[PDB]
């Protein structure tokens, strides 16, 4: 299912890559998902 939780990619987001793990880049707020934006 990959990040299922009945919630797909967060709206108004833009994942990227730090300097693995990856994240949806929560620029809209002020942090970064390090495991799941909503699980």
């Amino acid at each position: 299912f990959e990040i299922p939780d009945d919630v797909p990619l967060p709206a108004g987001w833009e994942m990227a890559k730090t300097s693995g793990q990856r994240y949806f880049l929560n620029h809209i707020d002020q942090t970064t998902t390090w495991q799941d934006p909503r699980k």
Partner: peptide, 10 residues
């Protein structure tokens, strides 16, 4: 180690 992503608190 595992550093966080860029764009931190202003």
């Amino acid at each position: 180690g595992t550093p966080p992503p860029p764009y931190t608190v202003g």
